[PDB]
Ligand binder design. Sequence first.
Ligand code: CL7
Ligand code: CL7
Ligand code: CL7
Ligand SMILES: C=Cc1c(C)c2cc3nc(c4c5[nH]c(cc6nc(cc1[nH]2)C(C)=C6CC)c(C)c5C(=O)[C@@H]4C(=O)OC)[C@H](CCC(=O)OC/C=C(/C)CCC[C@H](C)CCC[C@H](C)CCCC(C)C)[C@@H]3C
Ligand SMILES: CCCCCCCCCCCCCCCC(=O)OC[C@H](COP(=O)(O)OC[C@@H](O)CO)OC(=O)CCCCCCCCCCCCCCC
Ligand SMILES: CC1=CCCC(C)(C)[C@H]1/C=C/C(C)=C/C=C/C(C)=C/C=C/C=C(C)/C=C/C=C(C)/C=C/C1=C(C)CCCC1(C)C
Ligand SMILES: CC1=CCCC(C)(C)[C@H]1/C=C/C(C)=C/C=C/C(C)=C/C=C/C=C(C)/C=C/C=C(C)/C=C\C1=C(C)CCCC1(C)C
Ligand SMILES: [Fe+2]
Lengths: 36, 28, 28, 284, 479, 35, 68, 65, 323, 31, 31
Amino acid sequence: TPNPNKQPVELNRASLFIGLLLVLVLALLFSSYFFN
Amino acid sequence: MDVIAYVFILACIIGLFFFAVFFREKPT
Amino acid sequence: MDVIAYVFILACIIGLFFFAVFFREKPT
Amino acid sequence: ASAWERFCSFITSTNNRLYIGWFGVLMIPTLLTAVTCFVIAFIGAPPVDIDGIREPVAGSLLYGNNIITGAVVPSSNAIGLHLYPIWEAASLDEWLYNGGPYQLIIFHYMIGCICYLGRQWEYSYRLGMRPWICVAYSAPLAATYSVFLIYPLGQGSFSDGMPLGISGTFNFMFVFQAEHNILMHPFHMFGVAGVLGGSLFAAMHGSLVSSTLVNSRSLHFFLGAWPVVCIWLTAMGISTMAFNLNGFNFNHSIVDSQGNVVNTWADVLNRANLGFEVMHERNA
Amino acid sequence: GLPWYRVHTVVLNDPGRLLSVHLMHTALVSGWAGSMALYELAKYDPSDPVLNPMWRQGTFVMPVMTRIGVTHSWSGWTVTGEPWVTQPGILGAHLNFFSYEGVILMHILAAGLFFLAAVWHWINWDLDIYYPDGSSEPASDWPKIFGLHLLTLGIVCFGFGSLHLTGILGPGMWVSDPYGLTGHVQGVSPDWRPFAFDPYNPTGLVTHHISAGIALIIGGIFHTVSRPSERLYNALSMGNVETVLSSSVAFVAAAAFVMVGTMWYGSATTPIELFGPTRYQWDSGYFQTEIQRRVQSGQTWDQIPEKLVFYDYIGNSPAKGGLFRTGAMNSGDGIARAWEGHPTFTDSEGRELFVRRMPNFFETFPVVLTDKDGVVRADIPFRRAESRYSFEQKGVSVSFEGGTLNGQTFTDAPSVKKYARKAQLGEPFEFDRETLGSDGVFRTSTRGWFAFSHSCYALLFFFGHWWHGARTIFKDVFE
Amino acid sequence: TITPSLQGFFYSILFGAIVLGLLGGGFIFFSQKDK
Amino acid sequence: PKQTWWGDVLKGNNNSEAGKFVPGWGTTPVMAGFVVMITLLLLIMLQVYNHTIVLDGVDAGWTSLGGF
Amino acid sequence: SIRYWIIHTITVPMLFLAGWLFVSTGLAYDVFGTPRPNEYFDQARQGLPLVTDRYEGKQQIDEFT
Amino acid sequence: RGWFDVLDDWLKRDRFVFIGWSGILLFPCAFLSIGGWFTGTTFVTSWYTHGLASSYLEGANFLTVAVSTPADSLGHSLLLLWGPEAQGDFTRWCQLGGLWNFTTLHGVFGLIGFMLRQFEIARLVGVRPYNAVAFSGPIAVYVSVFLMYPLGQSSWFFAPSWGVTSIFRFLLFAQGFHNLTLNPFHMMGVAGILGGALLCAIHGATVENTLFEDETYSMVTANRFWSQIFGIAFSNKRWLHFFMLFVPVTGLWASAIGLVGIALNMRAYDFVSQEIRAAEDPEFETFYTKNILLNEGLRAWMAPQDQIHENFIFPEEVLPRGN
Amino acid sequence: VNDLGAIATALFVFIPCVFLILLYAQTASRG
Amino acid sequence: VNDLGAIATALFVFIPCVFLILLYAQTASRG
Ligand code: CL7
Ligand code: CL7
Ligand code: CL7
Ligand SMILES: C=Cc1c(C)c2cc3nc(c4c5[nH]c(cc6nc(cc1[nH]2)C(C)=C6CC)c(C)c5C(=O)[C@@H]4C(=O)OC)[C@H](CCC(=O)OC/C=C(/C)CCC[C@H](C)CCC[C@H](C)CCCC(C)C)[C@@H]3C
Ligand SMILES: CCCCCCCCCCCCCCCC(=O)OC[C@H](COP(=O)(O)OC[C@@H](O)CO)OC(=O)CCCCCCCCCCCCCCC
Ligand SMILES: CC1=CCCC(C)(C)[C@H]1/C=C/C(C)=C/C=C/C(C)=C/C=C/C=C(C)/C=C/C=C(C)/C=C/C1=C(C)CCCC1(C)C
Ligand SMILES: CC1=CCCC(C)(C)[C@H]1/C=C/C(C)=C/C=C/C(C)=C/C=C/C=C(C)/C=C/C=C(C)/C=C\C1=C(C)CCCC1(C)C
Ligand SMILES: [Fe+2]
């Protein structure tokens, strides 16, 4: 019996660019400490 | 080798800028 | 640490077997 | 359809992906030059004799530093305010050793910033809107010109300019505090109020609009105006401190009736400044 | 589709799948417990319980295991300093099984079982129980479910307090002396006199878990029977599970803060034999006072128990580490091997002066050998400066009591300077860095990592509580 | 046995009760007044 | 909607009285007292931990470990 | 309007003077323990009165007083 | 209609200001905190805790008055007016620094009352309480700086004394001893605050300069302008304003986590490779190393007087200098 | 430097990135 | 052993795996 509550997941292009910017900027900020 | 990590992250950022500028979905 | 690499690959293989057995799309 | 007219219609056209305009004609080469030299001199560049004492200071990635500690060192103390073009240099290696790349970067960057402001005005004109985005943008422009141009002019050499790096910025801040006590200068207090209040008003405005959207024009006017005015004031404060017109000083203020001196917080602050200063000033 | 930050709301209206994701999370948590303990065992050095305890070795879960009974290993070694004797002989002497590896095995088994249950409940999401007698919409009564859960936890708390902690039917708990010398796992007896509220006396813990346990049982029974009140039921929206989420998140944040407080200030739950010394025992000169009194009590210097002198090193303080200085402490100043002995300094005139110890705050300190009367006698001037009160100009010998450098007397100026710096770093010690490539910069013990991580967690979970309270109270608006 | 610190805490409970009582009494009494 | 055995055992606890509440305030007054009670208890503990309150013969420190 | 003016005229300067006299008559120094300008040091008591013990702080100040 | 309903309706009645239930916690606590600060600056001195003249009676200035922190010897004692320290003596309570605890604790409860008040007002009007979630940031900053930091340290003495120059002393102390500027979380906090100011400024200017000649401004013109001038632009109004809300709050939370880290001396004080490389050869000099030297100097020159209770005595010989 | 510094940086760069790209791809394939 | 051995093994395990998972996800989202 199928579950009614299933819903898809959406993420448009602009959101992808925003997320990638956040991730790359955080990585650049914290790498200098990760390498210590 | 840290220099390679820094430069790679930076190059990825610049590529992201290029794609975000010239390939954004048209606002409407 | 090689032991960790080997064991991780092996565990991933076993998980793949579990999913391939009990979660295959129904043939029709 | 004169060739000159065709060119003008190309540049001053609202169908490019990025508007160029006559100001952008200067903006693009200068900004590209500054960016290219900054990247090159931040990845790899020799140590620079910042103190003009034949002893170098390194700031590049290939010479050991990382992003937090790397910087582009200001031009040497011996050069003073002299422009140091490559063709006016004895030898390329020497020219690097004296800190020419810093001069190249900051000059191209400042010209590009002012031309960018002009380009903002020009496109606001071309689209048919009131042309006062550039006025708002003039505040951070003033701040950069303060740290990079006006302060060295007041101090007589570009060696006192701000380094182009994350840790160089902090070193600049601490030396500036030591030599001028910027914290107790009212204009910096206006600037701090400006940034903190700007964040406060931004959060309030965003929360209100996004909560109810599920003279009101004067609201957005005030939003635009407040941080801009405060940044103008703090940029002017930095500029004044570039001419040895330092802030407030309340050291040695309360004295005991017989003649002793009772400490106040200002004395503790002065002693901290003393520590920062004596660690500075290599010799005397 | 849903935004990436709401993907899990697809189980909000489904009790079966909500239970399924809870079971999966439990499986993950138990699996992590097992794996982390396994890793710590695989990177451990049981040889040295004195100058290399578990907290010096970057252990995280081993002290938590050891707190309430588990001490030995199937490979034989105990953490208390003796090979384990199979004192177990009978049923109710599973103690030979529940070593570190026994606990690891049980936790991995629980992880697997919970994962299987989670898969089952994910598939069978439409069991009849989730639905009321005559309505298609699944509907659960949160107050009675809370009563049932509370009753279960009260039973388990009462059992833990009365049987395990007392040692009647359990290993008991870790207890120690005021100076972290003798560490037993012994039972405790509960006492309701007011001194059981002393946080450093373990008799409180048992007294708590008994009484509080009973309090939960009553509190369970009431909620298993009593209905809510219209007033409260409408105010708190007890029909909506989001309110349970909000209140639970707030509770868990408060718990994290209280735990951090105990971990940082020390208590009976956190003994220094397990988690290491606090940062206040260095500040208040706790161990230095104790040692100085003991020696002053007629004992010779070489007769001082080496644990008591290791605790007086400042490299043991949890307030000397860093945020990105990673790994065990022995990756820092290196692993200790021998105590060079208590040094004493004398100047040309023969006056006995002492080195001022570096407080927790300073990353570096200026070495200043001062007369006991408060007058600075000698010092080490700044990196290159001309002096009038100096080390060489005045001349200083150092003589060592006990330890490796016993009876010795270094008057070589570099040697005196080195041991002056060591003396200002607490007690001089033999440290090895060649084994691990240690960096000489310190690191924080287990106690510091606990405090930092869970203070961050509590701070974040308070914002989480506020957000979920907002989405509960404003439910009609948030849609 | 009672110590000075415990007695101080007891007086604290007295004062806190008084403060809360006066605040709540003022609020409820004024609310009842202009019903 | 499988009618399992365990579901039969537990359905009464799941949702027999789902959505039922007693009108008015009910036991809420009594709850009030309990809260105040614990509000003292915790408070006392804090001060005892804080050394604001010094109970007689209760030295809130590492010395209290004497006896183990 | 007019009525409250009488009350405020009678009262507000009285309060102002109340604060004024509270400072001038030296009462504030006693109330708040703030030293008189000559009380910071004696003719040679130039040492600082810093509390060193948590438990008997008030008595130690009484010694410093 | 029982007494409770009467009280509730009375609280919610329209007045010049709205009280609500939250008011019962906010107004007394806020008023007491403000009064405590004013009294501490006007009359109470810190001559016995820090050996300073931080009151108007002493003759201090508006920029130098401060409700200074309690003494170091008290540890983290709550300093109740009736505690083992004050023992009911108001003057000793003031001299010991109890006004700092009074002000800070009542400030905590005032902030809590204010957040509850925003919850209540949004409940009455019937809109999403994004304002309370926004205000959650300032509470995080306050709790991290005035409570968690001095609690992770030796005493309340290391907390920020309520003032202006005292807060400046706190900033310089943090740089000297924790090297805060190099902490990544403080960097995210700075970026958040400066970005919030940037967003406020350009949003205001844009809305003013795309006004229609009569929401009320040409979103299309603004979008095209920023796309062709800067490259990217907000094409959605809801996203624009939620971002304006989101940036400064996130900066505050990151800085809060940075401050709780340094409360445990879990500070990013140095980069190990730089220290090693500087140890190997003395020629290697970078800006970070000179920052380290400045920190050494500030510590040495500030410790003898800032932490007067420790009786530090450093001669002229041991004080670092640029020789 | 830390031998795990590069690995930590790489995994930090990669895991959220692949997550976001996967979400966007399975969004864009759908109409 | 080779310090790059683990990195090579990890990247070999990961890159084709993320490629395949991305293809399957952007297939299954589509009807
Ligand atoms: C240690 C001494 C000190 C302390 C403790 C201190 N400040 Mg300052 N401080 C401020 C806040 C502050 C706060 C809120 C605060 C407490 O929390 C402090 N401070 C504290 C701000 C109000 C104000 C600074 C705000 C500020 O940053 O001003 C703007 C400055 C700049 C450079 C903007 C740059 C604009 C450029 C066009 C950017 C374009 C280039 C970019 C690469 C493009 C990328 C595009 C794309 C590729 C992505 C400030 C200053 C300033 C100084 C100085 C010297 C200080 N400070 C010093 C201190 C300024 O010159 C300076 C000043 O006033 O001059 C302008
Ligand atoms: C049997 C006796 C008893 C026990 C032992 C008991 N309850 Mg109850 N109890 C609850 C939880 C509970 C838990 C979690 C719990 C065990 O931990 C218990 N109970 C236990 C809630 C589910 C439910 C009501 C929920 C409810 O509304 O609770 C009150 C509401 C709130 C917001 C809690 C107040 C929290 C503050 C924000 C804290 C702020 C901290 C501060 C910043 C600093 C602290 C300083 C410190 C030093 C002092 C309940 C009730 C209620 C009753 C009654 C009469 C009881 N009980 C009784 C009991 C309701 O009316 C009533 C009811 O409706 O029964 C169905
Ligand atoms: C960070 C502050 C916060 C806390 C701590 C918190 N929440 Mg939420 N939270 C929920 C559960 C929850 C639980 C069970 C829980 C406590 O156990 C918390 N929350 C706690 C779900 C019911 C609901 C949707 C959940 C939901 O959609 O989650 C999707 C999240 C994804 C794909 C990844 C997010 C990335 C994280 C960086 C993960 C990193 C790994 C992890 C950190 C390892 C450490 C473990 C542990 C120590 C933390 C929810 C929301 C939501 C938000 C927001 C903003 C929050 N929250 C915030 C918080 C919704 O929009 C949103 C909402 O309700 O909008 C409708
Ligand atoms: C110095 C920085 C700073 C100040 C002074 C400040 C001030 C204020 N912000 C408010 C609001 C907000 N601030 C917000 C975001 C932010 N706020 C920020 C930073 C600040 N915000 C930042 C960076 C942000 C961006 C995230 C939001 C989103 C809000 C609001 O919604 C709210 C508002 O509506 O503003 C109009 C407060 C509304 C009244 C109130 O509840 O007072 C505080 C209440 C009490 C009980 C104060 C108690 C006493 C305090 C805690 C200690 C004593 C202080 C002394 C009396 C004086 C000290 C003087 C100094 C020199 C030491 C108040 C005006
Ligand atoms: C245990 C294993 C864990 C693995 C890692 C998991 C990672 C999960 C993903 C993390 C990243 C998510 C990013 C979502 C990014 C994303 O899609 O954002 C856009 C998104 C839009 O929300 P909407 O509801 O409008 O639309 C949702 C859809 O578009 C996507 O679901 O809004 C948010 O996510 C709010 C928060 C924004 C946060 C970013 C704001 C700041 C951006 C710039 C900051 C950097 C530059 C600074 C310069 C100084
Ligand atoms: C505003 C400004 C900018 C432009 C120029 C201009 C000169 C106008 C300038 C104004 C300057 C001037 C003169 C400001 C005057 C400010 C002052 C002192 C306001 C003070 C009001 C005083 C108040 C609340 C005090 C309240 C005291 C309280 C509760 C006491 C609380 C108590 C404490 C602290 C101890 C325990 C006992 C008790 C009673 C609970
Ligand atoms: C399947 C099967 C059925 C029958 C029985 C049988 C035993 C055979 C069973 C098998 C069971 C087994 C082998 C279970 C193993 C379970 C395991 C290892 C679960 C995983 C635990 C790992 C976890 C949680 C991950 C934690 C990672 C986190 C937080 C992510 C990021 C991290 C955080 C946020 C803190 C800092 C460190 C880091 C890495 C940045
Ligand atoms: Fe707007």
